[PDB]
Amino acid sequence: MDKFRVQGPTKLQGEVTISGAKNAALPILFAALLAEEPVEIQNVPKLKDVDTSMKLLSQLGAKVERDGSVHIDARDVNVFCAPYDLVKTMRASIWALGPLVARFGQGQVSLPGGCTIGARPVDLHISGLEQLGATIKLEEGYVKASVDGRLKGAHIVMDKVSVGATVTIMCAATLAEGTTIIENAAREPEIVDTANFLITLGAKISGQGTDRIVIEGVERLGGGVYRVLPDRIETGTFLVAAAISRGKIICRNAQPDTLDAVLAKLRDAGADIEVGEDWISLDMHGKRPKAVNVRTAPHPAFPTDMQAQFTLLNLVAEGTGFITETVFENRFMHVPELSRMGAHAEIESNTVICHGVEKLSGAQVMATDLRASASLVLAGCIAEGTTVVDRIYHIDRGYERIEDKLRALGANIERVKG
Numbered sequence: 001m002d003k004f005r006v007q008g009p010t011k012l013q014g015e016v017t018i019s020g021a022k023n024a025a026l027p028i029l030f031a032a033l034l035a036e037e038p039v040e041i042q043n044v045p046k047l048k049d050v051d052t053s054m055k056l057l058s059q060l061g062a063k064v065e066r067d068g069s070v071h072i073d074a075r076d077v078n079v080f081c082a083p084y085d086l087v088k089t090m091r092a093s094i095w096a097l098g099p100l101v102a103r104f105g106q107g108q109v110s111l112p113g114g115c116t117i118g119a120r121p122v123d124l125h126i127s128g129l130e131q132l133g134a135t136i137k138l139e140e141g142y143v144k145a146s147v148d149g150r151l152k153g154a155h156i157v158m159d160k161v162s163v164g165a166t167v168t169i170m171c172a173a174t175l176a177e178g179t180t181i182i183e184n185a186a187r188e189p190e191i192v193d194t195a196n197f198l199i200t201l202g203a204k205i206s207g208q209g210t211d212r213i214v215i216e217g218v219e220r221l222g223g224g225v226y227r228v229l230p231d232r233i234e235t236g237t238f239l240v241a242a243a244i245s246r247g248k249i250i251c252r253n254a255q256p257d258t259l260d261a262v263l264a265k266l267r268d269a270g271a272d273i274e275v276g277e278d279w280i281s282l283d284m285h286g287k288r289p290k291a292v293n294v295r296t297a298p299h300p301a302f303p304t305d306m307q308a309q310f311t312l313l314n315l316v317a318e319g320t321g322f323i324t325e326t327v328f329e330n331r332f333m334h335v336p337e338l339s340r341m342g343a344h345a346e347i348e349s350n351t352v353i354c355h356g357v358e359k360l361s362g363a364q365v366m367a368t369d370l371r372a373s374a375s376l377v378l379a380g381c382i383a384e385g386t387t388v389v390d391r392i393y394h395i396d397r398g399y400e401r402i403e404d405k406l407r408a409l410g411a412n413i414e415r416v417k418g
């Protein structure tokens with residue numbers, strides 16, 4: 001059980017290089033199961049979620065190695081099941097289903113269960129596949145999919161907006177007979193990156209990043225080389241790190257058009273922001289941030305993966321600000337932890353109401369969330385005294401070596417093995 005011991009207060013300033021998007025890497029690694037010649041994915045972050053993906057790929061029969069880049073040879077894939085033991089540790093494994101059924105006509109993936117952040121059903125994944133001609137049944141907890149021959153292009157109108165299901169259907173359709181059209185598709189940058197990787201292998205896709213995606217089936221996909229886009233969530237997290245510590249920062253290897261909503265909100269909090277073509281700068285000019293009001297929603301609105309960080313900002317800001325969550329309505333476990341550190345907040349239904357205090361106090365807190373818990377580490381950096389963040393293996397799934405980057409910004413942080 002690793003822990004972070006953090007010493008503050010400390011003013012975070014300097015620069016940071018952004019790693020590749022964790023949530024682009026993942027879908028792409030699973031899309032590689034479609035490829036019949038070898039592919040190299042560049043700029044992949046070193047995260048536990050990538051490790052788990054590789055472990056699953058390999059288990060399926062693919063040939064996988066890695067450093068900066070990941071290498072995948074999916075020619076000899078010969079087992080078609082993502083077993084309970086893996087899926088339970090990372091529900092994104094469900095992404096194996098699509099490609100497996102599209103290419104080999106069969107696929108067995110464990111049905112994911114409960115998550116601490118809220119209800120997370122996969123009905124849209126299943127329904128999308130059935131609509132593409134797959135037959136799907138559930139036995140022994142496995143969703144078992146099969147198709148005689150290959151899938152058939154279809155006009156699919158999505159009941160609600162879903163990143164996961166949009167990816168599942170998009171990927172499966174690349175090897176179907178004819179044209180698939182996805183209506184009400186998710187527009188997340190990562191879905192664009194995934195589509196562009198697919199095209200690189202010889203797929204025919206258009207409309208990615210808009211609500212309508214068109215896929216023209218081809219008979220087989222090849223190999224190639226593709227570089228993953230920068231991680232907007234990591235970028236946001238560090239921008240926020242500076243904004244709460246009254247610091248200044250430059251983020252290198254960024255993609256600004258990816259963060260419109262976040263940057264706009266940071267300006268409202270009083271930050272001075274400039275952007276280049278692959279950098280973002282933020283300066284607080286020694287100022288304490290002003291409270292803001294936020295509502296999470298699918299891209300390009302403000303992202304749920306940034307919600308906890310902005311909650312922290314508000315909790316040390318001037319005034320009162322609320323944050324409403326419309327994507328994961330129970331994603332507030334960070335709030336009671338920040339309360340142990342002297343933050344003043346209440347939760348009414350799916351809105352947190354924050355009353356900013358001048359400074360927080362060090363305490364023992366517990367991580368539980370892949371992305372959200374990073375806010376506990378950030379809190380540690382600006383709190384008065386010593387904070388111990390327990391159970392950071394969660395954070396290790398989500399960020400590449402966060403302590404190294406924070407230290408290079410002035411943080412007093414240490415990883416211990418209690």
Ligand SMILES: C=C(O[C@H]1[C@H](O)[C@@H](CO)O[C@H](OP(=O)(O)OP(=O)(O)OC[C@H]2O[C@@H](n3ccc(=O)[nH]c3=O)[C@H](O)[C@@H]2O)[C@@H]1NC(C)=O)C(=O)O
Binds near residue numbers: 124163164303
């Ligand atoms: C928490 C993850 O980030 C999440 C990110 O929060 C969400 C939204 O941004 O989109 C991905 O999740 P996801 O695919 O599960 O999210 P979505 O499917 O868009 O969620 C849609 C919403 O509709 C619901 N939903 C989803 C699928 C479905 O079949 N039915 C359904 O009702 C879910 O409850 C959810 O509340 C990212 N996960 C990955 C691996 O990319 C992470 O960082 O690991």
Ligand SMILES: O=[P-]([O-])[O-]
Binds near residue numbers: 091092
């Ligand atoms: O359920 P898994 O995303 O921790």
